[PDB]
Design a protein around this ligand. Sequence first.
Ligand SMILES: *[C@@H]1O[C@H](CO)[C@@H](O)[C@H](O)[C@H]1NC(C)=O
Ligand SMILES: *[C@@H]1O[C@H](CO)[C@@H](O)[C@H](O)[C@H]1NC(C)=O
Ligand SMILES: [Co+2]
Ligand SMILES: [Co+2]
Ligand SMILES: [Co+2]
Ligand SMILES: [Co+2]
Lengths: 165, 165
Amino acid sequence: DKGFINIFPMINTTVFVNDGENVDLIVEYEAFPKPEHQQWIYMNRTFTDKWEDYPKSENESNIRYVSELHLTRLKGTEGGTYTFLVSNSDVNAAIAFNVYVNTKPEILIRMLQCVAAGFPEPTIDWYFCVQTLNSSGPPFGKLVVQSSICKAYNDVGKTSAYFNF
Amino acid sequence: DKGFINIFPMINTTVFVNDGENVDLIVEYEAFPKPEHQQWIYMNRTFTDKWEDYPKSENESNIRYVSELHLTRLKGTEGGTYTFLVSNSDVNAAIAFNVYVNTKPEILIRMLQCVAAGFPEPTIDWYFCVQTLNSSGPPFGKLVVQSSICKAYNDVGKTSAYFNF
Ligand SMILES: *[C@@H]1O[C@H](CO)[C@@H](O)[C@H](O)[C@H]1NC(C)=O
Ligand SMILES: *[C@@H]1O[C@H](CO)[C@@H](O)[C@H](O)[C@H]1NC(C)=O
Ligand SMILES: [Co+2]
Ligand SMILES: [Co+2]
Ligand SMILES: [Co+2]
Ligand SMILES: [Co+2]
């Protein structure tokens, strides 16, 4: 047999984190020969000092290794796929984590239009006393919904605003 | 000496309750002769079954009495002065409780105008990427402030909304 790299996640690959909280993406993996070019990537951007790598055993015959990425104070926009890559002289290997960041809806108004953004997808109710877009600027949220006929909410929170003529 | 009614509060007369929470307004009082016409009043409205009255002692020579008003699920609008009255054949006596209900700001928008309402008095900040009125209808809050130049907040919460042209 030749070289090999086998990766096992220590936590579930799909993780859910509340807005402003932390999460540690942990991976164990066996490799021969000595693993090289350990790397954590999010959005073509490489984390320089937010992660750590170390052998699981001090013993010389160890081929078990651990890599951890420390995500701190995650924002709703910082949700997405975080990828870990590693290689040796023979094999290239990778594993991916899907990080969801729960956020309460942010609503804006520009005949006005009410637009809610966040995760999970905010639903809009109207009380008396629908399309989907994807924008970078305000309001800041993973999923964006506009309702026309303003209260907005999801399983993590609610946001309201009144409008009169 | 003739008749007398002396009232002592068992809790502080000024009470602060968060929105949606409960509070028990408790009063002890000594009276001779037998107290009569015990009454709890808020906004000219008399609580019929939300309160209880009972002698502090079963013994016959007791002149000590207790009256409790159970306020449940208080709203921001339900903040104000709650009054307890009691009398006998000689004296009339009363005591008053000042109930504050903390609420996060509610903001509305009608050249638009942003109006925040709640308790304590909401302050308005503007981020780039003042008068005072008193209305019954939306937005619902004890103190109302309009700022013109929309984020709004107080020591109990915050509420935001964007506006673009
Ligand atoms: C995914 O991870 C969660 C914990 O965040 C766990 O409750 C769930 O069972 C996992 N799903 C699997 C292992 O299929
Ligand atoms: C008023 O009541 C509060 C408790 O709600 C207490 O902390 C405060 O000391 C009281 N003020 C007095 C007794 O003057
Ligand atoms: Co380091
Ligand atoms: Co949808
Ligand atoms: Co009763
Ligand atoms: Co003021």
